[PDB]
Write a protein that binds this ligand. Structure first.
Ligand SMILES: Nc1nc2c(ncn2[C@@H]2O[C@@H]3COP(=O)(O)O[C@H]3[C@H]2O)c(=O)[nH]1
Ligand SMILES: Nc1nc2c(ncn2[C@@H]2O[C@@H]3COP(=O)(O)O[C@H]3[C@H]2O)c(=O)[nH]1
Ligand SMILES: Nc1nc2c(ncn2[C@@H]2O[C@@H]3COP(=O)(O)O[C@H]3[C@H]2O)c(=O)[nH]1
Ligand SMILES: Nc1nc2c(ncn2[C@@H]2O[C@@H]3COP(=O)(O)O[C@H]3[C@H]2O)c(=O)[nH]1
Lengths: 450, 434, 450, 450
């Protein structure tokens, strides 16, 4: 065997089949419409055509060898793959694209390469490669812009070829609208022919005009049709690129929209300038360290298994430093990693207050936190990263005062990026391992007796 | 009247429309008089009379008319004559209007540019005309069109000023000097801001600079007008686009699984009837956006009287009734569709908001015991049961497209735990019937 | 009987009446402005106009026979239908359409066919047919794009007619802006006249220019107004076409935005290459097997009974394969099929694990799942489609060995799609029919002892 | 020390370093392409370049003084800042920018200003200043307009310089497409050269045409590429403008859609005309008084302490008037204001009804309350802003005339906006402050005595 379509090997072949398909979509019509392009480089075009046909045979062999999913499992039986490929429309499209029409070279002559206007029917491989690349690549917006620009270039090139063909059918130099006479030394060059056709197609499709007016009825009709194509088909792709470039920074746009909403609220409510400055400073801190993205609303579309694996992988350094789990067997961390809720606190913020009925336990991942006195000046113990706290009020223990209240108050010396484990969710996980329960209770009694 | 309120009293809307016409005359007629020689001494008296009439409208509005508007202060509408005048004096719009009316004696029409500063009246007029008349999106289209026309107007005036600065007929770029002398400059403006092209090429440095700045400004201006038009037509058809998108999403969902055309036709018919009758695809989505008091009041108006009549619900707390109405869900049943089937249990109370249902009885059904109309309530006894111990005695089939408000078990039961007196009263009523 | 508007015959008659309306909107103005088109084919236009008038009369009759929906019921009696039609504005519009203005042909000659502009007042029938076609067809966005392109064609054709009529009023060949002289044999042809008028209409509406500038005040006014129309009306329709094209790929745009957000989150957090490739493989699998669409969001606004009718047909094989459901429940399955939510599990993962709290019951749709002891080296048995598991953690048996915890773990080989049945949803759907549950306690009694 | 990034002095230096980057990104290429611009103003350009280099050196020094955050604490150690700055790519970019290439002026003459193109690599400071401006400005959409306009001006200026360089390489006056001969005194003016190049670039990049057609093949290629780039740029402009427009009308169009939806709901449901009129007046009051925005959705991204003190600052006039806030405890309000949910009531509404079970306690910030009898005419007592009621029903008293019931019919005289506080959340706050509890119970007993 199978090719494993979800694997990297199948994707690597998708690029190797996209090149002949793009060449057939690009240069077959160019050779068909520009006679000098086909005639001058006939050996090169024959070599490229043979290479593309060979890659087409290899692609058909791969599609016979590729494995689909039945009952959720990959199919390794060869005959089943043959039946699945042949029953699909893709086999018919590949066969129709690979009908050998080169024999018509012996009938219609070497100057008719439009007989290969079936080999671009295998656009499905190119579209599949574009769909797979868009998921795989690290720059999806850049790739989407490049793909749509490639579509624009293909459309303009095809319109240039069509305009040159219409000039050829009507006759070069017969009218002011058509391409000038081939006998002209300046306009007889193949490069000049192609680039003036491209210039005319660019003017017509990009709604510029600035072309000689049509003289014949067919010329007027084709100009109307091509301007309608430029207004409808071309300009829609143009607007899509405009929206995609405008929406490259979607997360930044959402963050800025939040900033505008909060600033408009503060301006309407006549909030003091100091508070507005503090809000601006907080949001600058959020944006500078890339804390503006929320993985609760981003990873919620992922499955719970894969989301839990990502949460384990991202925070692998900070949970191993926590002494309440990942110690006896390094297996408890899997259950409570999904229940971690990340919170960010400003400096000078009292995360825990004395006497409050805390409904959660806070696990420090980033930032330095201080155990504060009653006045707010004297700090006893400075808590570094990986140090758990707030575990007294979550569970009641016998022989303790203020079981549902915090024994001490905790403030953040600087910015702290710490998780908060809820009271109810920890009870479900802690009942599995009694040793962790009694260790937590012993530590709580040790810190509560004084 | 001594006191005038903006929400009603359409004479206020009419006067404010006259003020907007005066402001439009000032905004549209100052640049065409400053640039063009249309303000000839032969008809200078007409221009002076129109300007004096517009200034009279401005003076009347700022002095005798605006001070009569009643205002809200701390939720209370104030009707006193002195208080309205004091709040008007404290308002920003009176300061803008007073800055608009300034005496500039010095005949130059460029001295009336303060009169264009009375723009808050136009925005207020826009707000009330969005309020009074239904289908207000056409007024927004007309307003965006007017903004584009005013931009073209200003560009035409600037182009004629530049042509007169260089001299009419001096070269191909400037206005040549024959014709209506305004439609030509407006043609230049419409071909410049929208950037059609086809205009004569600029030769001198001033002409190239003016053409550059005009094209660069017009690119962003044309983008602004097309964005405003696109936003307005999107907001006008936002509900239609959302309903269509949901409908075709459902259609492609049923087509993906090869669902037979009967079920697909039923789904499409339900979608069409819901969109044509309700005007919207969901009711709870609109209800949750409203405040709690407004949602409760809407619940009371529609079906509190219907809920109050039924004997089982009688004797309840008033808040008991008010809470269940907020949880009634509107469901549309297609014609010839069984709302209730014999042989299956019932847990759903059915309140016929619209349409009629038929109760099926006799041998093998096929007979109408009763035709319950709108406002008839059936299935209430299914609510008060231990759960699964009751059955539908007869088939209930929707005779037509019927809209029913439904309340079901374990949705009323969570309201029972809120009010214990209602809990014990309903328990006593349930055990009394059984 | 009566004609039902929701019936197929009403849609067929809508199609049959739209063609006279489209013919009147296209050809009446063309014959009015291009007089030769009125004179050359008079024997054809008379027959077509009489046929259109006959079909208009038959449509008027149909509207006296079709029903209307009041109180959700269709009216059957003829008298109320006649009164409802005659009291509506549509009867007045139809009467104004079928006013015998053709008798003015005797007074005005055959040269002036613009007496049939009253017959464009049946635009409501054409708009209604277009509205009804959108819901009926399988490709509605494509039809909407085609309808907007048709509206563009109508506007361009009408502008061409207006330009030709304005040139006729001013004078042919008088100026460079107007249409040239008819006495010229190149521009005297009717086809040339219409095609050049369409050329001018297309370039002026699409804001192309590249036409001779106006030389008269009336010409300047018409040119300014027509570019105004092209900016305001034409560009609005083009933007609407772009909007429908965007709504075609709205699901694609949203899913790719989710993928981009997840990848951008994983790019900043420095997630390992293996996890990133696993996420990419999962999303590529979702795209390949068309599992991106979720039935919860799609079927959000539907009745419970209609959603049951949809969901029974989709999951017909699975609920008939399971022994306990659709065989003994007798109506409970209808309640279950709404509460079941689809979920996909990657190969090799553990859907459920020993010692973990179970909040939902799992029903296999198209997956291959196995029962393993600790690690997965050996499998006791494989679970095919329709087999159920995970019900023990939902409800417990009297004298249960374990309470509110999972007894065994199920490993997923291959990509398994399967239903999930939440504990509270199962409680709601199970309290209604306790009778069929005794098989579930029987199975729990058998499997907990071993 | 060190310079904090969040401080205003870092913003000031961002502006003072963006100014030379503004100068370098625009004028360097202009001097490189327009040789008369460099030759005539050589003294001014040398002075400005030396000033820009000095500012670049000071910026490199400031980057060493800029303090990042480790464990959420500002890094005030000089050696750590030096090691952190030099490790980043920005240090390499700053070194490349400040590489001395003015010494190449001796080898290459004074007519080669493009040796300073390495100084364009400090674009990061420019973009950092521009994104810092967007967050902190009070007019974000005006700044976005200015940013987009300046970007378009920069790109048009660069394309103008490219066109002038292409004309210089081809030769001035050799073709009609290139810039005309510089020996002609009208075309030889430097202002004329720059302005016509900018005009050509504006025409090409904003899709207007109106330029002489290309003559050479290279001119055709450059014009096609420039037109395609200009189409993409115009699309980006249109997308940005539409997005900005949508954002501005985000709240207003949503509110108007809500108005249309509620009107359609009332028309469909046969809602009484009095209630319909009252609701339309209610919505008009909410929109005119700008009370339609909600504090929960806008401020949910803020920290809990920051949001709490913002809610204190907004409602500072009314919280001090309440007898429970800033009267005895002076500090209960900071933790209790988060639990207050704002609500609006139309005139004639009933806040509470006698004989109804109490759910929340009401705090008045604005509006007038009637406290009406059962008849609907007489009022026992008027309630002003900053008052509280509805607390004696939710408070539990052993001896009460009415048990857990409202004791009066509260009526809103007009459009009263209140704060509702749930009973259980109040009991959470009341237990921590027994002194606040006792006086509240005493007031309840006193008001229940009569
Ligand atoms: N009382 C007390 N708490 C400490 C000390 N060191 C760390 N803590 C943590 O600070 C936390 C504050 O909230 P809790 O009382 O819930 O739990 C407390 C402990 O987890 C200490 O020395 N004394
Ligand atoms: N069986 C029966 N039901 C009726 C009749 N008339 C009205 N109904 C209503 O039909 C309803 C069917 O469901 P319920 O048994 O809950 O309640 C029934 C009554 O409310 C009748 O004559 N016979
Ligand atoms: N314990 C056990 N469970 C099984 C077996 N075969 C299937 N299962 C199912 O696997 C499920 C795992 O979750 P539960 O313990 O809730 O319920 C379990 C059973 O439904 C088996 O042989 N032993
Ligand atoms: N009983 C009573 N309550 C009043 C009076 N004036 C104001 N109130 C307040 O109105 C409130 C209505 O709800 P509650 O009965 O809970 O508490 C009531 C008191 O707080 C009064 O004169 N008598």
């Amino acid at each position: 065997v199978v090719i494993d379509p979800s694997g990297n090997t199948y994707y690597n072949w998708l690029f190797c089949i996209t090149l002949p398909v793009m060449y057939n979509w690009t240069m077959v019509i160019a050779r068909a419409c520009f006679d000098e392009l086909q005639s001058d480089y006939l050996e090169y075009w024959l070599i490229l055509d043979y290479v593309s046909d060979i890659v087409y045979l290899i692609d058909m062999f791969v599609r016979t060898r590729t494995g689909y999913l039945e009952q959720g499992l990959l199919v390794k039986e060869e005959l089943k793959l043959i039946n699945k490929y042949k029953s699909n429309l893709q086999f018919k499209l590949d066969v129709l694209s690979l009908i050998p029409t080169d024999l018509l070279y012996f009938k219609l002559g070497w100057n008719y390469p439009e007989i290969r206007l079936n080999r671009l029917l295998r656009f499905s491989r190119m579209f599949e490669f574009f769909q797979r690349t868009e998921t795989r690549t690290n720059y999806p917006n850049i790739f989407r812009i490049s793909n749509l620009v490639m579509y624009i270039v293909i459309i303009i090139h095809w319109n240039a070829c069509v305009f040159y063909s219409i000039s050829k059918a009507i006759g070069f130099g017969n009218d002011t609208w058509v391409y000038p006479d081939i006998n002209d030394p300046e306009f007889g060059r193949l490069a000049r022919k192609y680039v003036y056709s491209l210039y005319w197609s660019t003017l017509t499709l990009t709604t510029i005009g600035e072309t000689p007016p049509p003289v014949r009825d067919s010329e007027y009709v084709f100009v109307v049709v091509d301007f309608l194509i430029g207004v409808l088909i071309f300009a829609t792709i143009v607007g899509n690129i405009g929206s995609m470039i405008s929406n490259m920074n979607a997360a930044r746009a959402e963050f800025q929209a939040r900033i505008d909403a909060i600033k408009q609220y503060m301006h309407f409510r006549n909030v003091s300038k100091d508070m507005e400055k503090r809000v601006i400073k907080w949001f600058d801190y959020l944006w500078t360290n890339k804390k503006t993205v929320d993985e609760k609303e981003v990873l919620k579309y992922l499955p719970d298994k894969l989301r839990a694996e990502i949460a384990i992988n991202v925070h692998l350094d900070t949970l191993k430093k926590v002494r309440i789990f990942a110690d006896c067997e390094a297996g408890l961390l899997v259950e409570l990693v999904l229940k971690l809720q990340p919170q960010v606190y400003s400096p000078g913020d009292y995360i825990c207050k004395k006497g409050d009925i805390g409904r959660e336990m806070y696990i420090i991942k980033e930032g330095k936190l201080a155990v504060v006195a009653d006045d707010g000046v004297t700090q006893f113990v400075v808590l570094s990263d990986g140090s758990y706290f707030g575990e007294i009020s979550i569970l009641n223990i016998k022989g303790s005062k203020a079981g549902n209240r915090r024994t001490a108050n905790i403030k953040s010396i600087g910015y702290s990026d710490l998780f908060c484990l809820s009271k109810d969710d920890l009870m479900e996980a802690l009942t599995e391992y009694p040793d962790a329960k009694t260790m937590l209770e012993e530590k709580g009694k040790q810190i509560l007796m004084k | 009247p001594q006191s005038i309120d903006p929400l009603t009293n359409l004479m206020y809307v009419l006067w404010l429309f006259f003020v907007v016409m005066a402001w439009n005359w000032n905004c549209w007629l100052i640049p065409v008089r400053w640039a063009f020689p249309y303000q000839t001494p032969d008809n200078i008296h007409h221009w002076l009379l129109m300007d004096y009439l517009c200034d009279l409208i401005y003076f009347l509005d700022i002095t005798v008319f605006q001070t009569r508007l009643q205002f809200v202060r701390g939720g209370d509408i104030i009707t006193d004559k002195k208080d309205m005048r004091n709040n008007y004096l404290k308002s920003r719009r009176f300061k803008m209007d007073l800055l608009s009316l300034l005496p500039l004696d010095f005949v130059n029409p460029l001295l009336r540019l303060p009169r264009c500063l009375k723009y808050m009246a136009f925005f207020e007029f826009n707000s009330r005309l969005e309020s009074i008349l239904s289908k207000a999106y056409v007024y927004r289209v007309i307003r965006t069109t007017a903004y584009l026309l005013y931009s073209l107007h200003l560009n035409s005036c600037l182009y004629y000023w530049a042509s007169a600065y260089q001299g009419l007929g001096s070269t191909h770029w400037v206005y040549d000097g024959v014709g209506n002398s305004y439609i030509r400059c407006y043609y230049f403006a419409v071909k410049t801001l929208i950037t059609i092209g086809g205009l004569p090429d600029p030769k001198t440095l001033f002409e190239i600079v003016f053409q550059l700045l005009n094209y660069f400004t017009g690119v962003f201006a044309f983008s602004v007008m097309i964005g405003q038009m696109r936003d307005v037509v999107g907001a006008a058809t936002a509900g239609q686009t959302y309903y269509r998108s949901c409908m075709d999403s459902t259609v492609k969902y049923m087509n993906f699984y090869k669902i037979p055309k009967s079920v697909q036709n039923r789904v499409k018919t339900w979608y069409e009837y819901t969109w044509h009758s309700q005007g919207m695809l969901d009711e709870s989505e609109l209800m949750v956006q409203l405040p709690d008091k407004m949602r409760l009041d809407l619940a009371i108006d529609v079906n509190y009287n219907i809920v109050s009549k039924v004997a089982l619900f009688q004797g309840c707390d008033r808040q008991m009734i008010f809470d269940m109405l907020k949880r009634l869900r509107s469901v549309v049943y297609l014609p010839n569709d069984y709302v209730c089937k014999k042989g299956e249990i019932g847990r759903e109370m059915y309140i016929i908001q619209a349409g009629q249902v038929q109760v099926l009885g006799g041998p093998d059904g096929k007979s109408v015991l009763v035709t319950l109309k709108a406002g008839s309530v059936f299935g209430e006894i299914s609510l008060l049961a231990v759960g699964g111990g009751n059955r539908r005695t007869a088939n209930v089939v929707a005779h037509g497209f019927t809209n029913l408000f439904i309340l079901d078990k374990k949705d009323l039961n969570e309201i029972l735990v809120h009010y214990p007196e209602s809990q014990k009263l309903l328990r006593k009523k349930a055990r009394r019937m059984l």
